[PDB]
Amino acid sequence: RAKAKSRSSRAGLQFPVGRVHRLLRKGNYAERVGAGAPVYMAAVLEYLTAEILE
DNA sequence: ATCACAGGATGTATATATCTGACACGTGCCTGGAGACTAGGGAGTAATCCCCTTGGCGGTTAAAACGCGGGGGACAGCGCGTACGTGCGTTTAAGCGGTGCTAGAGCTGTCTACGACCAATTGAGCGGCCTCGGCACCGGGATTCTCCAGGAT
Numbered sequence: 601r602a603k604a605k606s607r608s609s610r611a612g613l614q615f616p617v618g619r620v621h622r623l624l625r626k627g628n629y630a631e632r633v634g635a636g637a638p639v640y641m642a643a644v645l646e647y648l649t650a651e652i653l654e
Numbered sequence: 655a656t657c658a659c660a661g662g663a664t665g666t667a668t669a670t671a672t673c674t675g676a677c678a679c680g681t682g683c684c685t686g687g688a689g690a691c692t693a694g695g696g697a698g699t700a701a702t703c704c705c706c707t708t709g710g711c712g713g714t715t716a717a718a719a720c721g722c723g724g725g726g727g728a729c730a731g732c733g734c735g736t737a738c739g740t741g742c743g744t745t746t747a748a749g750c751g752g753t754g755c756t757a758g759a760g761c762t763g764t765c766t767a768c769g770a771c772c773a774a775t776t777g778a779g780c781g782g783c784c785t786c787g788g789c790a791c792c793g794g795g796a797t798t799c800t801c802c803a804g805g806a807t
Contacts, residue, residue, distance in 0.1 A: 632769060
């Protein structure tokens, strides 16, 4: 049994990834969401967040 | 000097006849709509808890309302001159039609890596709690604005 590990850490991100994946698959955006979509998106939201805050 | 009218010139709308290709209708599929069936999760209902909206009171205070005087902008009127509009004649390449080539859209069939799904485990994040520190406000002083008088242009 591997230890549970936050994806944000894995991706080197501060924004949550599992949650983004979760949001993407529902809200009825699509029947299915690919593994790399949540990750790509989390990076984008984080990037923009940084620009405004900076 | 201005009004209107009549004539000409021009451009528009009108009826007419003919042409053609874009619609209206019919045929033959064929695959998506409709009927029939079960299974189970979402929506509906009521309980009820308590948070937050409503209404009311009294002070106190800044903010609105009102009035007056006077400068400054909005507006109308005038005249200059030039930058556009209109019409003519020459030049351009747009549009039409047809030809020929093949690059890439669109569809078929096969196979497999990917994600939905489900059950188990747990730690990342949310609610509630205390603590005190950055921000808002007070009062005083510094200096940085605007505006008028008087002396230049």
